[PDB]
Write an enzyme that holds these catalytic residues in place. Structure first.
Site, PDB file in Angstrom:
ATOM      1  N   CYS I  77     -38.208  14.189  -8.526  1.00 34.99           N
ATOM      2  CA  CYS I  77     -39.385  15.352  -9.025  1.00 34.99           C
ATOM      3  C   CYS I  77     -40.757  14.976  -9.640  1.00 34.99           C
ATOM      4  CB  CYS I  77     -38.830  16.052  -9.820  1.00 34.99           C
ATOM      5  SG  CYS I  77     -37.862  15.958 -11.295  1.00 34.99           S
ATOM      6  N   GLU I  78     -41.712  15.232  -9.059  1.00 38.22           N
ATOM      7  CA  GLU I  78     -42.785  14.010  -9.519  1.00 38.22           C
ATOM      8  C   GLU I  78     -43.187  14.632 -10.576  1.00 38.22           C
ATOM      9  OE1 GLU I  78     -44.544  15.543  -5.531  1.00 38.22           O
ATOM     10  OE2 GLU I  78     -45.713  17.243  -6.608  1.00 38.22           O
ATOM     11  N   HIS I  79     -42.412  16.078 -11.016  1.00 38.82           N
ATOM     12  CA  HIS I  79     -43.134  16.278 -12.479  1.00 38.82           C
ATOM     13  C   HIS I  79     -42.194  15.839 -13.514  1.00 38.82           C
ATOM     14  CE1 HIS I  79     -43.240  20.927  -9.965  1.00 38.82           C
ATOM     15  NE2 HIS I  79     -44.058  19.514  -9.490  1.00 38.82           N
ATOM     16  N   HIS I  80     -41.085  15.575 -13.484  1.00 40.60           N
ATOM     17  CA  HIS I  80     -40.623  14.630 -14.445  1.00 40.60           C
ATOM     18  C   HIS I  80     -40.276  13.367 -14.175  1.00 40.60           C
ATOM     19  CE1 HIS I  80     -39.367  19.156 -15.380  1.00 40.60           C
ATOM     20  NE2 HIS I  80     -39.990  18.462 -16.356  1.00 40.60           N
ATOM     21  N   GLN I 118     -38.884  19.676  -3.925  1.00 43.32           N
ATOM     22  CA  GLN I 118     -37.344  20.241  -2.752  1.00 43.32           C
ATOM     23  C   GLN I 118     -38.683  21.256  -1.761  1.00 43.32           C
ATOM     24  OE1 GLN I 118     -34.016  20.754  -4.065  1.00 43.32           O
ATOM     25  NE2 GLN I 118     -33.804  21.933  -2.188  1.00 43.32           N
ATOM     26  N   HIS I 146     -30.948  19.120  -9.323  1.00 43.01           N
ATOM     27  CA  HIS I 146     -31.662  18.434  -9.975  1.00 43.01           C
ATOM     28  C   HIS I 146     -31.777  18.120 -11.483  1.00 43.01           C
ATOM     29  CE1 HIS I 146     -35.348  19.970  -6.697  1.00 43.01           C
ATOM     30  NE2 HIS I 146     -33.399  19.861  -6.720  1.00 43.01           N
ATOM     31  N   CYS I 148     -33.515  17.043 -13.908  1.00 39.73           N
ATOM     32  CA  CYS I 148     -34.622  17.950 -14.651  1.00 39.73           C
ATOM     33  C   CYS I 148     -34.170  19.186 -15.200  1.00 39.73           C
ATOM     34  CB  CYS I 148     -35.984  17.168 -13.954  1.00 39.73           C
ATOM     35  SG  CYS I 148     -36.371  18.486 -12.983  1.00 39.73           S
TER      36      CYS I 148
HETATM   37 ZN   LIG Z   1     -38.354  17.549 -12.595  1.00 37.49          ZN
END
Ligand SMILES: [Zn+2]
Ligand SMILES: [Zn+2]
Ligand SMILES: [Zn+2]
Ligand SMILES: [Zn+2]
Ligand SMILES: [Zn+2]
Ligand SMILES: [Zn+2]
Ligand SMILES: [Zn+2]
Ligand SMILES: [Zn+2]
Ligand SMILES: [Zn+2]
Ligand SMILES: [Zn+2]
Lengths: 184, 185, 185, 185, 185, 185, 184, 185, 185, 185
Positions: I77-80, I118, I146, I148
């Protein structure tokens, strides 16, 4: 004299890959492979008329007949590795019904060839259409491919669904859905 | 390595002999793909256990049994050249050394990517691990389905075969073997 | 080998005696189909163990137990001539030689395609394997459902019967037997 | 009704022709047991729908669909005289009359205990129900496995066949049919 | 021999006492139906073990354990006259003689179709089999749900009861009992 | 208000007629236990819908469907006085008012603890809820097994029956009924 | 000032792999990663005495207490990729029992670190031994490893079992078997 | 017994302190409903074992183990006053006395409907059973999920805890204990 | 390509900052392994769709929908920067061209081995297939868990996320989309 | 924010009123633990939607539905103050913006950690998402088990309740709603 030719080719194949055709575990292998392959390709030399025999009877009703879960084994023409699974057959009669065992025999006729799953389904459907000339036919093939599992991408959870719909199974939405629903 | 050109030629002829047309669109590149495929399916013969393990041998953290299960494998039976596949379960009790978990999978592949008989596959995997870690004992269970039994001949569909190899304490200590096997249940 | 013409006649008379019309379009070819069917279902008497094995006997790779499970079988009970079916699980510890996996299935079919009692089926399969391999021991477990018990008589629906035969170490060594049985769970 | 003595002798000779010994301790009473079995398996030919129902008809409580699912059945294929079996699912919308739940099983057995083809079995069960009650509609779904496909010929193992019959509103009202079919999933 | 007329009378009065109309359309034939029902549900008292087994006792094919599992049963608890049901699993080691599978179901029904206590049911079935075959040992396990516990009183829903009886080697040989019990798992 | 003494008497005579000893240790308190049992099993007749619901009727939080599934129930079939049981699924779209979840279970028990017919049970539960909440619509599905069918008579084992009742929008809106039924799958 | 340092490192990591820290989906990523990692390594700075608190009570009986299925998440020290699964704890008291929730807190203390599954099990077992001083302790860890699934060998059906047995769980065969049997 | 009015007021104030409005239509009768709920949830403190058993003790039918499994239970943890629940498995070997199956559920509820810790609950159930009957041995296994772990604090979701108590032969005879434990798998 | 040296340095420092000792035996080679790992986990950015597909585009055999399901994927995931993984289901209706089944897996990996969300993953996979085959329509469903969300923060354990992309006839034809989705059930 | 000291006192008095000893070693710290617990279980009232979302709102990647299923939740029914729990399934079709997956879980917890009725929980979660993203539509399905219904009162064990809230296209478009629901099966 094909079996002998296959035997020789198989024997050389063993050497080219680094094996020894002389060791005990490989002695009769070239012969075993030859026979295996004559069996795995026997579908090319089969005749539909003979496969069905005299197992066509007068229809008893008008509702859809569904023969599901007919296991099959085939060889992908791209890599010559096995792909297998199940074939689900559905059809609405027009005066004639087929002996249940003949559906499996028809499936085996087209499976025991070099194939692509998309083709396998259409050929099975078309063969049934020719033999019975039903109001409609539906064929769903679902298989796992070793050329995708034991080599290349090496995915493990994947399986492919292909199908062929003829007659009322193609033109009647409700009829198709009813057939597909029976498979769930 | 493997003479891909000869494999291609052999495959092209195989197509002709079984009754197919090597000229049709769906088979044009088949000999080539098949040659590459078989080079890969037999790459195990050309591998070295020391290179396969690499630098993934570490000090043991304890003296308890480590069980690595469900390692999927794919092989070719030396009797009919048809695939047989399934899972490999590995168990061992350390003696100062433990292996990187991913290396078990690499060892399994090294011996699976060859022409095999399931009985031998279990033994060689177990022996390879004994050589790398010199553990107090090693246990290996192989469970697989065989296409030469489903796709042809007897054509049985529900059968699975279980083979294994027990070394060191896994062979001599009944309780240890039993505990390993219970973990697989 | 079997007088198909006589079986046809017997079957034709059978249809007439039960109250059916041998002339129906759905029964015209029935006596013929029945005759062929029964020749197949009793082909086990005409088979020879050494021809069934066909020299697919190889040198043992290890000392560990080999367990071939889930071999489907179909048979006819000698008591009511109604089918009984299920699975046969085979386990054995080699003594120099192992058998080609598919031969176990062929041995199973050889004794299953006869009129039987499940108790005898387990014994004969085990003895056959004992003769072919002269192993340190052999274990056989047959699990089946009996139609003579569900579509007739008591008409029970949830029942299954387990029979078994243990030879050599599978009989003499409690631990080897338990290990074989544990593998089946 | 059925001539048990005629059946006995036919079965006794059947044993001889297939290669068995009627004198065997295990086959002694077989010809007798087979005659009675086949008399039981064909009893549906001699049953009367009026007596099977036994006046167990009651006034309807509502106008909603009644679904009786999972009624196991056992039958014999007229082509090979081998058993095929499974379950029968029945659905109907009343018109002032409902049937005793257990009578549905009695009707199923009446038509199953004959020589059949699955396509006909479903139609006769539905027609029988339409005759007994005067429902607005009837739906019958039969799902069975056929031993003629499993223990002989093609020897397929995962196959199951679905046949059905729709009468009244189950044939006219699309939503009603879908609702019935959905209840079975 | 049970007085059906007296039962109809008692049943008719039963309907009144609880505050229901015996003249109601769906209850007119109830006292009659309940009478026949209870005659069937208690027929086990009126059966002879000798007739139940018939002549289906044959010579043993081997000395290994025979396990007949999943024989469903239905009974009535003597304390509340409410049904309790489930399955009966039977295991035994023959001494020269074995029983026809189906006869096991008949013996179960013989003792189940009475007013019972699950503990007693397991004992009577085991003693019956011991008397019939006089084997080396017999093991019987009964597992069921009791409506008197879920439909009334405590109203527990997830509970099941296991009762059993062990005779001969199933009591004397610890390994034998364990092996029988393991087959049930 | 049910005459417990009269029931004990009838129950005591019931035990004698079937050929059992009422003086037996495990039957002395049976007539008493059966009396109390049947008073509980028919208490539904002596209940008021107003008291059953109590004051647990609150304002609706939204206009979306509420589905209370898996409410187990136990009842007695009026035809044979044998238990039938399973689950009741309730769905409804409120019109300003919603019910306390548990009260749904009480309404089910109110109509189940009587002599019933599954078709009627589904209707009475639906009508009760309609009367209490006066919602836009109510849907009720009952699914159960009947001992009169599996423990006696036909003795089928795999069968289950589905009955239902649809009021308001569950009858008028096809999408609404389908959505309710789909939630149950 | 560790979070800020991690943020900067994470920002550069993004660039080195070919990404753009300036695009919308990555704006707060360096910060999110920093906090995530402080949480994923918090176990190093936890104290057992504080983790247990005052949740140790007098034993009620002598039989084994089994706390199974305590899910955990950890990071393998070899590749810095997650491995997760369940921890099964079994023990026989000697006058003291632990609050069930504390077992999960102890599991989290050692899981939220850079680990190897073999070590995780021994440390959990040893921590429980220190807190309760029981007659014996048994710990079984079963996890799946992403460093084996999403990279390298890429196997999909594998899972690893590691354990630690102290006191009577190590020395009494029947006691161990009884514990392991409860897990089946 | 319990002061419902005291509980009512305590609950009413509890609502205020947590930040809610007791005047809300949805909270109007809450303090009352909570008082009665907690009186029900603690009723086990005021129950007498002698009355719970209600003399439902009968002479033993055999010497074999009786296993009553899956008796669901609901309790409150004394540490957080949050529910924990699951099932209770009971096993025992009689000594001339057996208990009515439903009384086991009544005993379980007697000790569950209190403030508890799972370790104590199992011991008290076993001790209660040993007191009522004079068994040769008793075994009790409790398996539950704890909301204090799930909806708060650690918030683990897959965890379940097993506690037990063995008395008499279940503690002395190793095989007996294993047999009991095996029945639960 | 990727500067492995800088990645190693960054990783070595990361170890120091979180509190670890980059010098200890278990971490000595960690920076190196991590650098290689991330080069692999991001190799998708550096791939070309034309090279990925190769020469695996063939003529269509029919006009029916082809569904390739269960293609496992692993992404970040590009967020975490934490992994999210699961399966990708692909469906399409040809227009003269069909793809080699293994290439779907290769396309999935090309877009998965990058930093992703996703929602985007499904769209890019669908678009890549539309570009390669110019089919009448394409459908792609991605189902993943996920870390995260499980390993930190909210720490939910039972959640899974479903995203998808529908092109051509899969977007405009409701029946076609529905049929594709039904195949996934 | 909550007066923990007052909750402690109330809880201490609670323990005394139910009949327990506040001095027990197992209850000494109970009032303190209970207070902390309840502050946590009601923290949902003190949370702010915009702080819960925390700007983790991103641009939509596609037009297709996003379905976040299986988000576990735990709550307290305002009626009896007993826990009810299960799962929340969320579906939405973006209009420019999508939400970070974990925020859905945080929104779920925000409304779950309050005193609730399942009907309101579904509405508030849906409305919250509607406010945060202003999607083309949002659908929410809550499925839960209620302890006030199983450990008290009616004491049903198999029941589960489904509530839902549909906004925008999930309400206006029958096909989008069905597609969301189908994904949940
Ligand atoms: Zn994430
Ligand atoms: Zn291929
Ligand atoms: Zn082979
Ligand atoms: Zn028989
Ligand atoms: Zn047939
Ligand atoms: Zn009772
Ligand atoms: Zn009835
Ligand atoms: Zn790693
Ligand atoms: Zn607690
Ligand atoms: Zn409540």
């Amino acid at each position: 004299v094909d079996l002998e030719r296959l035997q020789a080719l198989a024997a050389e194949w063993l050497q080219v890959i680094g094996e020894d055709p002389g060791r005990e575990g490989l002695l009769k292998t070239p012969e075993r492979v030859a026979k295996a392959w004559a069996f795995l390709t026997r579908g090319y030399r089969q005749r539909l008329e003979e496969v069905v025999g005299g197992a066509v009877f007068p229809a008893e009703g008008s509702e859809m007949v569904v023969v599901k879960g007919v296991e099959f084994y085939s060889m992908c023409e791209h890599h010559l590795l096995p792909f297998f699974g199940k074939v689900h057959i559905g059809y609405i009669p027009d005066g004639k019904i087929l002996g249940l065992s003949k559906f499996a025999r028809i499936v085996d006729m087209f499976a025991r060839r070099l194939q692509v799953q998309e083709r396998l389904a259409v050929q099975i459907a078309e063969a049934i259409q020719e033999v019975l000339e039903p109001q409609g036919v539906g064929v769903v093939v679902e298989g796992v491919h070793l050329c995708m599992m034991m080599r290349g991408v090496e995915k493990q959870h994947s399986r492919t669904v292909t199908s062929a719909m003829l007659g009322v199974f193609r033109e009647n939405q409700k009829t198709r859905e009813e057939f597909l629903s029976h498979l769930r």
